[PDB]
């Protein structure tokens, strides 16, 4: 399925994912698209920061849902 | 500011809004774009259906945030 990741530069990234993908797996997909190491990524969905060892489905992130990326200070 | 409204047809509607806009005002803006009467719209943000008399800001809906439209 597709999900979207919006950045503070006003970009929208489209990712190809499965619901059982871990957040860590999603950060790897963002690294593929943007070159940002996973350790520099803060991913947020509906106001909550996401944990690397949990899945998309653990957070009820569904097809065509939008996450937010913030780089760590 | 801009917000987005995604539909079940896969469309993404861009709206121009202010944070103090009521949800009813937002439904009017969707009517402008799609012709859907406000009474036929269910608007959802982060899993919660939105009340007509409350504002975008009441729900913490920010610039470039995405809502979901489901028809009744």
Numbering used by the authors:
A (entry chain B): 1 to 73
B (entry chain A): 1 to 72
Article sentences:
Post-translational modification of proteins with the small protein modifier ubiquitin (Ub) regulates many aspects of eukaryotic biology. Ubiquitin phosphorylation is emerging as an important regulatory layer in the ubiquitin system. This is exemplified by the phosphorylation of ubiquitin on Ser65 by the Parkinson's disease-associated kinase PINK1, which mediates the activation of the E3 ligase Parkin. We biochemically and structurally characterise semisynthetic phospho-Ser65-ubiquitin.
